[PDB]
Symmetry: D2
Subunit: 212 residues, 4 copies
């Protein structure tokens, strides 16, 4: 029988885009392809407002847009927990929290784009103990992205290369490089982003005067 899996994507989602969404679909299809898993749920967890130097739209707006984006999904949902904490939280702690909730046992895996794996290499960015826990205790499903070589990142990381059974590389056969930064700039300039992000998200953005 197949192992039940829940995919957790942590990120800014400022705003959520069709690209972030496609990431779940490709990841799910990949895991199902292996024959060993049965993805049962997808979770979008927007980062807290105290994170980073960049000024994101308020967390309640990012959760609301993600929710609207997912109204048309029958397996992916947004979870505000992380954004509703008083402070930013390292991702491994978000995995721990969501794992606990699952026990109130499916496997919880972190879902991310290849650019994320590359940040594992950034000085003082991620704790090595955390990278190890993520791939050893939970699991990692990485979706390809132009200009990134996931296989190489894994091979060159002493930590990742020792936990490949728990790392799944899902290749993106389509060229999808739509930047959220670009989306925000286009909106600020009054230009269309239709067909780049869900219509409901576009409406919400207009209604609430976001990115202007």
């Amino acid at each position: 029988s197949r192992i039940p899996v829940v995919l957790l994507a942590c990120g800014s989602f400022n705003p959520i885009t069709n690209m972030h969404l496609r990431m779940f679909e490709v990841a799910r299809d990949h895991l199902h392809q292996t024959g060993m898993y049965q993805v049962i749920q997808g979770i979008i967890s927007p980062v807290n407002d105290t994170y980073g130097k960049k000024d994101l739209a308020a967390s309640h707006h990012r959760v609301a847009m993600a929710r609207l984006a997912l109204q048309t999904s029958d397996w992916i949902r947004v979870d505000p927990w992380e954004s509703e904490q008083a402070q930013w939280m390292e991702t491994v702690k978000v995995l721990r929290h969501h794992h606990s909730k699952l026990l109130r046992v499916p496997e919880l895996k972190l879902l991310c784009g290849a650019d994320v794996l590359k940040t594992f290499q950034t000085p003082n960015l991620w704790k090595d103990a955390h990278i190890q826990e993520i791939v050893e205790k939970f699991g990692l499903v990485c979706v390809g992205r132009v200009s990134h070589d996931p296989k190489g990142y894994i091979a060159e990381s002493p930590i990742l290369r020792m936990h490949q059974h728990n790392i799944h590389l899902a290749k993106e056969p389509v060229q999808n490089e739509i930047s959220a930064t670009y989306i925000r700039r286009a909106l600020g300039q009054g230009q269309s982003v239709k067909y780049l992000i869900p219509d409901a998200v576009i409406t919400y953005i207009k209604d609430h005067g976001l990115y202007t």
Copy 2:
């Protein structure tokens, strides 16, 4: 005052995708940017079933999917005329027909991706007299595409370079290279194409057993 413009996109739309749709949005924003035009309507005209060697889904299905895709557009519509003719028709004749309908005067311009301009160079593909009429009588709005150099195609074409006032190059700042061929293959394999094409189009495809 601004010159009223109607954009006509001729193609297979087998099926229509978010990329084909984004093409209209970018083209419209570009023309509006110049300050000289006011795009009043967009028209998707699916090619007839006798065209080419490739086996397309029946024209009534392609029109139906385009219609569903456009239900959420307030300015773009599908026009079945071309696909409802007994035989394939050169594009200039589709422009002539739609121009006549406009008179029962806005400017009618052909909308296409950069790869189209490149086919103008294919031996025995397009009649030179037709390429001239399209750019001289109507106009051409070209949206960028990875691997294509529209400025060079124009400069190297004796015909195009003499009619640049009627050619508008709209640059696509986003990397959007989602192939319809890939979409069809993914669907045939039972894989998701959600977030690549509109949900309503996906539903229609399933309902009518298309691309299987």
Copy 3:
């Protein structure tokens, strides 16, 4: 053991670029990775000057630039035969010629980008019987390109599908979409194309005043 293979690339090479050369390397590694082939040579065959609607630099120059580009390759050479003929020649005929030239005999395969595979679909472009002879009697090695889906092209063409075993899809996880059209325009504007095409080619272009506005 491994069967010998010669790769033939027909195209404009106006001018030959690093991308065109990369195609040969990717294809060879791919064929070797299958374990059944041993690529022994690559051939660059610039198209005749009567070809198409686009003005190409003289074949004399395109052959020269390819030769100079290939001076640093130990397995790929340029062959001017096709360009020296009185007129343009269908690709199947160039394959036939080079096959005879080879005549326990190595297999000659057409090397091309995925885009060319898409052109097989173009009405009145390639004769169906030629596409058939190309994939059946020779073989095709196709290198991936952004925006193209070679697997789908093959599945949607009855001819390609039937002879798919003779079609080798090589994929390069790299994005190398550098068009020769852009190369020519940049050169005409006095901009650099260094590191996009070989230094020897840029030298020849400058020395012979090619691609000037």
Copy 4:
């Protein structure tokens, strides 16, 4: 008339690739096209071996490969100073050093890809005062890269926005997303990387057994 400019590129260059070199050419043409600058030199400065978490080839080798790659450039040279220091050094300090070296004086600007511009946003990575001195006292020339939106990065950073006149966005209408990570993995697998990095670099790599699995 035009003010003289020296371009400084700090990075790993593990190994230097055609893409890294292309960056210099695109940036120079861009600056010249503005009409107010005259690029007189480019400098490749490989990072110190104590840098980061990733294992890099020895700086001795990275400097050597850059020198060999640049033998065919008449304006870009490699400078080992940064890599010869006892430890990693913040980029603003390397700029300060090379500026003093120049000391009616040319302007020294940091040359980088758009991705580096995005790293300015990374928490605890770049000191805000350094980002400020880099864009105000030196200048930044950024080359576009797929998936990045330099214009938005600048608009969203108060510091960058305030000194945007000293940030030059160069765009190359070409897709050249060839990662050095892929280059290293391919080399470790015995695959070709010819036409992705300079022939002289491949020779050095083979001769010194670099990037072996």
